[PDB]
């Protein structure tokens, strides 16, 4: 709704779609926006107008902005926290940790076409910490090796 | 199970407890799964059984996590077992 | 092949708790309890609701394990303690007894809604049929709830929402013969409770009558049975078992007065219930007793909408009550608070370099 | 004026300058700021002060912030939408699509020194969609090739 | 306190710590946040509630947001101004300008383990402009060389 | 090895100046000068202070070279010119003389605090012992200051803060026999100044008495000496030397009236000072003279807290005064405004490619 920020809200509508579809949908909207084909509309409050009724729009005016400002800070924060895995400044970060069939013995077509993100992140939830640890280790080894040349 | 023996013609107090030390919803039932007593938050209710009358609890101890069944004017015919329904701790006691 | 890829912007939620806040159409000039409370406790209502429907999302809801319920409980218990002050209050601490001044106050519940703090949103179940738990196949996201009028009552729930299409029977376990069954009606039944200004006699000043349509009551109860029979097809609504008077009789508070009503005429035109206004009240707020000031001279009445029932069955479904948290569950059953965890991972056909 | 955000406003004053000059101007201001030679001043409203006059500054206080918050979201959005052309996270993105003399048969010195951005984006406006399509294609081919090694 | 923004405030507590410790601390918090182990709490104002008392929270509500919005703009600005040294989009940017023993004749272990950032930036303050000039020059030469292939 | 690395997010501050703003608990309905000024000049106070303690940070403060002091001076001089308007004002411009209407006004100083503009923060010295300059070993960051009640006085500073544990002797150079020594007390001493409503006689209507406890004065002065002896162990508090009457006697303004008090009974129960209310005032605002309206008929009194002294020594430390900037230094001594410069550099064991 509100409270999540534009970054999340523009992606949230894909919650009921497959993983593959979500990636394609984001690509398409970006194309239309870059080309000047479609425009993004605002959903922000108009501000009080009448002094006697102003509490109605200054309370919600401020709360709406607080939600957006915090969403920006969270977005920008994560974009740099990801430097640990070598994924800073990115939406899609491909790395060198191989996928374990023990985490999930499925093909990529099965995962991307017959599942949604809501399901995928439940099937492998108990390996999340394992994988995250490995991502950090891989980044450390890459940095080690580059600095030896 | 916990077995409590009286003098037949008197009174017995059987107890259920919770580790929360809070007043929580609870019920007491006999072996035929018929309600005897229980609460509804702060309020005490009675079960529509042979023990609908002659029975009470201690509302003041509910916030200590203590939910007793007190049967008054006790008869030998009341010497059945009883089941606690406190959280999932379905403990059993017997009245003699 | 099959390398780990990290994705940011993954539309995945997890259930979460937070210090959820209230909003209402508070006034601050009419002296009434809810509007002199809500003016410092709650913010103005949301001027721009979003209702985002999340496609084909299916979400597992559980009205009996929800947290929004506890939060509503804390605000209402604060509201009552801060307004309908008893003359004498006895809390079982030996006991601890205090007394307070008893100005009488207007008391007319207003809808209050709960709103998500920044970073959170509320998922809502939009199914016409939903039994209170398990997957809901039509989910939308909102910031604020519909609004619940905090009526505190037993046996019959007044001024709540309707099920719209069918009477819905909701229970954590419909067969355990322990939990209260919440029956949400798809139609409201009017109840007109009056204490006329001619009751000036004393031992009278505490008597009142509630008038219920026979046609409406009979149709509603027949419809309830039709659903009860689906669950229990081999059996063919009775007197309460007994207990504290707030459970045994129907009870409510209007105009600041505490009414207790005999419902055996309903569960066995113009069906009349015998009602009495009482001063010694068992608190719903916790264990203890309280004395309230004697009745107001004049004519006091309220016309309420019966929107649901609390029924129980043993090992002939009887009216039940108490446990105010359950009345709020009957309205909060469709909502949960979630947070978004945008960082996720999946195998892909790529590698670095 | 306001309503555009700091990202645009700091660039907008170059609207009357040549393309070459605009690039140099941005470079210079960045140098002075990084070095601690110059400072950026604020142009934000002071907030109400007096309760009886507060409508004047809460309406405009909120509107000024709304403009800035939306400018931030647009900036950050475009910075990732550009991932399609392989230009995410950048102000200046050099790519491998060659310039067509048919789009504009001019030298780079003529374009950068004797023209402003206002003129340049009009002379080639009817090729904008062609070029954008090619930019996407080139990025797809680069990704295809890197992942074949 | 406030007025600096979340970017600074999350780093400011390290002002009394050594340089080495500060880097490690940032790494750890990022790990805990990426893994979903810890959560960031908000410190934002609740908004007025009561109309008659609203000046108290609309003045400070707006000022708190102004501070955060400006912090975001400064953060994003610097992240691109740094393109001059070839450090755009980064927190830690390693370059090819060698360290001069004349700027400071110390080892890296002495600097990172026995000093805080408050001390380090004072000991070499009179070389700051020299170094910054060299960083720009190095970036220019790198760009020159890459574009000759 | 040892290559330059650029780091962003470096927690390093530098001292800076800015258009610092005021906040106070202003009222706008009581007609009093500070609350009809602050209502347009200052914002509501900070509802959510942070007090971030910066670890083991050591910071060099200097109360005599601070800028916050000048900023407070500009607001107070504006406050007085905009309120306590003289009937006759003479500024040495030949001279330029103007006259103004003289309504009398209530005059009761309120605490006013200074707050950092966005992009800035204030560092505060939390040491119990701090002599006004040099490294402070316990530093926290705040947006707003404690709040200074802008009492304008000489010799004795009224209604300021206390040193809590010890009397602190602060001087730019304790041995140059030129600068004023600010003595901050760790305890307040009460002074009760009254002009009773029986002084209706005229040549009287301008006489008032200030009552000081002997026990409190003697203990305080003994404690001051104990510290003075650490600095000056070979010597064992005297009459002022003379000068403008605002320096020679103690002076203050309460109720809008300007009081001048004889302090020789203090510096040589119920010690009484002889006080007079005067109409011709030498301005502290700049060089010039001003006439104020004659005394109010009725009973005027103020009870104030002595929180510090201004003493001087020549080449027996005498009361001093004037230079209002110094009274404000005694409260602003612990604060400085800084900015953060997040971009820094250091050598590391890495290279590009
Ligand atoms: C479900 O919702 C419905 C609304 O849709 C609720 O129904 C309302 O209930 C309230 C409370 O009973 C009722 O309010 C009264 O309306 C009267 C209209 O004339 C008012 O006069 C009355 O105020 C008097 O009583 C108050 C205290 O009870 C006093 O505080 C107040 O000062 C007034 O008292 C003076 O005047 C009387 C009359 O002369 C005299 O007797 C007193 O001594 C004193 O001098 C209330 O405002 C609404 O009118 C009802 N609304 C409708 C449409 O019928 C219903 O209560 C909700 N259900 C539940 C369970 O909450
Ligand atoms: C240190 O702090 C303390 C507080 O902790 C300060 O002490 C306060 O000082 C003020 C100013 O002297 C004093 O205020 C007066 O209180 C009186 C209470 O009865 C009021 O009556 C009086 O108002 C009258 O005088 C005003 C002008 O002086 C008029 O503007 C006003 O209209 C009133 O005047 C009418 O009424 C009087 C009385 O009948 C009559 O004589 C007049 O002619 C006219 O008709 C002030 O409000 C506070 O009471 C003191 N507070 C305490 C707790 O004692 C102290 O001043 C500070 N120290 C320094 C140096 O600033
Ligand atoms: C999911 O629930 C929504 C909300 O009730 C349904 O959409 C509404 O449909 C009615 C007509 O019946 C319209 O008047 C409303 O304006 C619609 N609301 C919104 C937010 O779109 C929706 O049809 C339901 N979907 C399914 C599959 O059951
Ligand atoms: C640095 O100063 C702070 C602020 O006074 C000290 O922390 C306070 O300590 C008291 C107890 O003496 C508590 O009641 C306060 O709540 C604390 N305030 C804060 C903001 O934490 C701190 O102890 C001092 N540190 C040193 C080393 O002197
Ligand atoms: C405050 C704020 C910050 C950022 C955003 C934001 C908006 C859109 C995207 N777009 C995206 O994620 N895509 C997927 C990857 C792809 C395909 C090849 O590149 C491009 C499209 C990202 C962030 C919104 C608000
Ligand atoms: C919300 C917000 C976000 C970003 C900005 C912003 C400010 C300045 C620039 N600077 C720039 O575009 N330059 C041109 C390229 C160059 C020369 C080699 O690198 C450096 C200078 C970019 C974004 C402002 C506000
Ligand atoms: C508006 C706003 C914008 C950005 C931020 C922000 C928060 C945290 C970081 N994190 C960081 O600097 N780290 C150091 C380097 C490392 C170790 C290997 O990568 C990761 C951790 C950066 C920016 C906050 C607010
Ligand atoms: C999967 O986990 C096992 C340990 O259970 C390990 O031996 C194997 O190498 C792992 N495979 C991948 C791709 O990580
Ligand atoms: C529901 O109640 C029945 C009857 O007592 C019992 O057998 C069953 O295990 C209960 N199920 C749950 C989930 O509690
Ligand atoms: C209650 O009174 C209203 C008129 O005010 C009437 O329309 C309604 O039908 C009555 N309800 C009952 C149950 O009699
Ligand atoms: C209830 O019904 C009886 C029918 O005889 C009627 O006299 C009475 O006035 C009604 N009361 C109300 C409140 O409608
Ligand atoms: C209702 O009144 C009848 C008498 O007519 C009595 O037997 C019954 O117990 C009462 N019911 C309640 C719930 O008070
Ligand atoms: C049920 O209540 C109605 C009220 O009109 C009464 O006529 C009927 O006799 C009652 N039946 C029983 C079994 O109590
Ligand atoms: C309730 O059921 C009992 C049998 O258990 C019967 O005796 C009683 O009359 C019934 N009461 C009502 C109001 O239906
Ligand atoms: C029920 O009450 C209404 C007034 O509220 C009246 O018009 C109607 O005639 C009453 N019905 C009966 C059966 O008394
Ligand atoms: C009862 O429902 C009707 C709609 O059928 C509505 O007009 C009336 O206001 C409702 N009454 C209450 C108390 O909610
Ligand atoms: C320019 O467009 C023509 C088609 O009209 C095409 O054949 C030629 O290769 C293009 N040149 C470039 C540099 O794209
Ligand atoms: C250090 O500065 C001197 C000039 O004083 C220069 O000759 C030398 O090459 C510099 N060394 C480095 C690493 O920059
Ligand atoms: C402090 O005063 C003494 C005595 O006059 C003088 O010798 C010394 O140089 C002064 N120090 C400073 C820093 O002014
Ligand atoms: C001033 O008067 C107050 C009573 O209002 C008294 O407590 C205080 O001790 C007095 N101070 C002096 C110095 O006499
Ligand atoms: C000061 O002390 C003298 C002692 O004789 C007393 O008469 C007088 O009233 C006191 N004045 C005040 C303002 O307390
Ligand atoms: C105080 O009064 C005495 C006379 O008792 C006088 O000698 C002295 O100079 C006066 N002091 C001041 C500061 O006015
Ligand atoms: C100092 O003042 C006190 C006031 O009580 C007086 O008794 C004493 O004689 C004075 N001493 C000198 C040296 O003036
Ligand atoms: C101040 O000192 C002088 C000597 O320089 C002495 O004559 C005078 O009496 C002293 N006055 C007081 C009040 O101590
Ligand atoms: C000082 O004044 C107070 C009243 O303010 C009085 O009670 C006390 O007795 C006085 N002390 C002396 C020595 O006169
Ligand atoms: C003087 O200090 C006491 C605490 O010891 C305080 O209660 C009183 O209000 C203070 N008076 C003034 C004028 O600040």
End-to-end alpha-carbon separation of chain A, Å?
51
Closest alpha carbon to C76 in C43, C46, C28, C33? C33
The count of CB pairs under 8 A between chains A and D is 72
How many Cα atoms sit within 13 Å of E76 on the Cβ side? 28
Q: Nearest CA to CA, how far is D42 from chain C (Å)?
A: 27
Give E-chain residues touching C43 at CB under 8 angstroms.
Answer: 47-49
Phi, psi of F240 (to 5 degrees): -65, 155
**Lookup: tokens for F212:** 């000081």
Residue where the block lists tokens 């993983």: A19
CA B80 to chain centre: 12
Distance CA F224, CA F267 (A): 12
Contact of E139 with chain F, judged by CB distance below 8 Å, is answered with: no
Task: Provide CB contacts within 8 A for D108, sequence distance 6+.
Answer: none
Distance CA B41, CA B26 (A): 9
Tell me if D50 CB under 6 Å of ligand 6: no
Give D-chain residues touching E121 at CB under 8 angstroms.
Answer: none
Distance CA C324, CA C80 (A): 13
Distance CA E79, CA E73 (A): 10
Containing H/E element for C326? Answer: helix C325-332
Burial code (b: 16+ CB inside 10 Å, e: under 16) for F226-236 equals: eebeeeeeeee
Distance CA F64, CA A86 (A): 50
**Lookup: tokens for F49:** 């202070």
Burial code (b: 16+ CB inside 10 Å, e: under 16) for C271-308 equals: bebebbbbbebbbbbebbbbbbeebeeeebebebbbbb
How close is the Cα of D77 to the center of ligand 6, in Å? 15
Distance CA F349, CA F353 (A): 13
* CB within 8 Å: F120 and E3: yes
Ligand 24 atom closest to the Cα of residue F267 is 13
**Lookup: tokens for F41:** 């000049």
Q: Which chain E residue shows the shortest CA-CA distance from A74? A: E40
End-to-end alpha-carbon separation of chain D, Å?
51
Distance CA C94, CA F251 (A): 62
Burial code (b: 16+ CB inside 10 Å, e: under 16) for E31-57 equals: bebbeeeeeeeeebbbbbbbbeebbbb
Ligand 12 atom closest to the Cα of residue C265 is 1
Exposure of B88 by Cβ count < 10 A (0-12 exposed, 13-18 middle, 19+ buried)? exposed
* CB within 8 Å: A1 and C52: yes
For helices A55-81 and E55-81, give the axis angle rounded to 10 degrees.
30
Give C-chain residues touching D149 at CB under 8 angstroms.
Answer: 353
**Lookup: tokens for E128:** 């700051």
Phi, psi of F326 (to 5 degrees): -70, -30
Q: Cβ–Cβ contacts within 10 Å for residue F324, how many?
A: 20
Residue whose CB lies within 8 A of the most ligand 7 atoms, among E26, E68, E71, for a mutation test: E26
Tell me if C269 CB under 6 Å of ligand 15: yes
Q: Nearest CA to CA, how far is C9 from chain A (Å)?
A: 7
Distance CA F153, CA F323 (A): 10
**Atom 5, ligand 10: residue with shortest CA distance:** C303
Ligand 3 atom closest to the Cα of residue C52 is 20
What is the residue-wise DSSP string for A59-125? HHHHHHHHHHHHHHHHHHHHHHHGGGGT-TT-SEEEEEEEPPTTT----HHHHHHH-BHHHHHHHTG
Distance CA E108, CA A36 (A): 51
Per the entry, the structure determination technique was cryo-EM
Please tell me the total number of residues recorded for chain C in this structure: 353
What is the residue-wise DSSP string for B51-86? TSSSEE--GGGGGGTEEEEEE-S--GGG--EEEEEE
Task: Provide CB contacts within 8 A for B49, sequence distance 6+.
Answer: B30, B34, B35, B36, C314
Q: Cβ–Cβ contacts within 10 Å for residue A107, how many?
A: 12
Domain range summary for chain D, segments of one domain joined by +:
1-149
**Pure H helices in C65-174:** 68-81
Q: Which chain B residue shows the shortest CA-CA distance from C92? A: B60
Containing H/E element for F275? Answer: strand F271-278
For helices A55-81 and E19-34, give the axis angle rounded to 10 degrees.
110
Q: Cβ–Cβ contacts within 10 Å for residue A57, how many?
A: 22
What pairing do the DSSP bridges indicate for beta strands F96-99 and F13-15? unpaired
Closest alpha carbon to A55 in A63, A66, A65? A63
Ligand 14 atom closest to the Cα of residue C238 is 14
Distance CA F79, CA F328 (A): 15
Give F-chain residues touching D34 at CB under 8 angstroms.
Answer: 343
Q: Which residues line ligand 11 (CB under 6 A)?
A: C 192, 194, 209, 211, 270, 272
**Radius of gyration of chain D measured on its C-alpha atoms:** 21
Whether the Cβ atoms of residue B8 and residue B75 lie closer than 8 Å to each other: yes
Whether the Cβ atoms of residue F336 and residue F15 lie closer than 8 Å to each other: yes
Please tell me the total number of residues recorded for chain B in this structure: 96
Burial code (b: 16+ CB inside 10 Å, e: under 16) for F25-56 equals: ebeeeeebbbbbbbbebbbbbbeeebebebee
Q: Cβ–Cβ contacts within 10 Å for residue D101, how many?
A: 8
How many Cα atoms sit within 13 Å of B72 on the Cβ side? 6
**Lookup: tokens for B71:** 């049967």
Q: Which residues line ligand 1 (CB under 6 A)?
A: C 104, 106, 108-109, 151, 153, 158-159, 252, 254-256, 296-298, 300, 302-304
How close is the Cα of C220 to the center of ligand 14, in Å? 21
Q: Which ligand is nearest to the CA of B83?
A: 9
Distance CA E31, CA E25 (A): 10
Q: How far is CA B69 from CA B61, B92, C95, C113, C325, in A?
A: 12, 13, 22, 40, 24
Q: Cβ–Cβ contacts within 10 Å for residue C50, how many?
A: 16
Q: Nearest CA to CA, how far is A109 from chain D (Å)?
A: 18
Q: What angle do CA F63, F67, F68 make, to 5 degrees?
A: 85
What pairing do the DSSP bridges indicate for beta strands C120-125 and C139-142? antiparallel
Q: Nearest CA to CA, how far is E65 from chain C (Å)?
A: 14
Ligand 18 atom closest to the Cα of residue E103 is 1
Distance CA D50, CA D38 (A): 34
What is the residue-wise DSSP string for A93-105? EEEEEEPPTTT--
């Amino acid at each position: 709704a509100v409270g999540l920020g534009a970054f999340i809200l523009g992606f949230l509508g894909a919650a009921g779609s497959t993983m593959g579809a979500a990636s394609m949908a984001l690509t398409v909207q970006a194309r239309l926006l870059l080309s000047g084909i479609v425009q993004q509309q605002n959903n922000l409050l108009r501000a009080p107008e009448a002094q006697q009724h102003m509490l109605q729009l200054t309370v919600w005016g401020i709360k709406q902005l607080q939600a957006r400002v915090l969403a920006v800070e969270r977005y920008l924060r994560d974009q740099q926290l990801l430097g640990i895995w070598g994924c800073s400044g990115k939406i899609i970060c491909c790395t060198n940790v191989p996928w374990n069939d023990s985490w999930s013995n499925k093909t990529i077509n099965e995962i991307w076409d017959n599942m949604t993100w809501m399901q995928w992140e439940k099937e492998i939830d108990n390996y999340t910490q394992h994988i995250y640890t490995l991502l950090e280790v891989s980044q450390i080894q890459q940095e080690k090796n580059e600095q030896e040349l | 199970k916990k077995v409590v023996l009286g003098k037949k013609g008197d009174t017995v107090e059987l107890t259920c407890t919770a580790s929360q030390k809070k007043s929580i919803q609870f019920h007491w039932k006999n072996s035929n799964q018929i309600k005897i007593l229980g609460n509804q938050g702060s309020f005490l209710t009675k079960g529509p059984s042979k023990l609908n009358d002659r029975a009470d609890s201690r509302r003041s101890l509910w916030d200590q996590g203590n939910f007793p069944l007190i049967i008054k004017n006790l008869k030998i015919e009341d010497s059945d077992t009883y089941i606690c329904e406190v959280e999932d701790q379905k403990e059993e006691v017997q009245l003699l | 092949k099959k390398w780990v890829t990290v994705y940011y912007g993954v539309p995945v939620w997890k259930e979460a708790t937070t210090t959820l806040f209230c909003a209402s159409d508070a006034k601050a000039y009419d002296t009434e309890v809810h509007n002199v409370w809500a003016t410092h406790a709650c913010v103005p209502t949301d001027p721009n609701p979003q209702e985002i429907v999340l496609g084909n999302v299916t979400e597992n809801f559980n009205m009996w394990k929800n947290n929004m319920v506890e939060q509503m409980h804390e605000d209402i218990i604060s509201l009552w303690d801060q307004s309908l002050k008893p003359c004498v209050k006895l809390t079982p601490l030996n006991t601890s007894v205090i007394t307070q001044a008893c100005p009488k106050v207007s008391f007319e519940p207003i809808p209050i809604h709960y709103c998500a703090p920044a970073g959170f949103a509320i998922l809502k179940c939009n199914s016409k049929t939903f039994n209170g738990s398990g997957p809901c196949t039509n989910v939308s996201t909102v910031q604020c709830t519909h609004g619940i009028r905090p009526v505190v009552s037993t046996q019959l729930l007044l001024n709540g929402s309707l099920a719209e299409e069918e009477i819905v029977i909701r229970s954590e376990n419909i067969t355990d013969n322990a939990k209260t069954i919440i029956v949400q009606l798809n139609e409201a039944v009017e109840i007109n409770c009056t204490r006329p200004n001619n009751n000036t006699r004393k031992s009278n000043i505490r008597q009142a009558h509630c008038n219920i349509s026979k046609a409406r009551w009979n149709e509603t109860l027949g419809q309830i049975v039709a659903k009860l029979e689906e669950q229990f097809p081999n059996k063919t609504f009775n007197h309460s078992s007994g207990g504290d008077p707030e459970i045994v009789t129907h009870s409510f508070n209007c105009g600041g007065e505490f009414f207790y009503c005999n419902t055996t005429p309903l569960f066995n035109q113009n069906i009349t219930l015998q009602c009495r206004i009482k001063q010694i009240i068992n608190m719903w707020q916790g264990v203890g007793k309280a004395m309230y000031a004697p009745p107001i001279r004049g004519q006091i009445r309220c016309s309420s909408n019966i929107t649901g029932l609390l029924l129980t069955r043993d090992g002939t479904f009887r009216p039940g009550g108490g446990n105010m948290r359950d009345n709020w569950r009957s309205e909060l059953y469709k909502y949960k608070v979630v947070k978004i965890e945008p960082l996720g991972i999946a195998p892909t056909a790529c590698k670095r370099r």
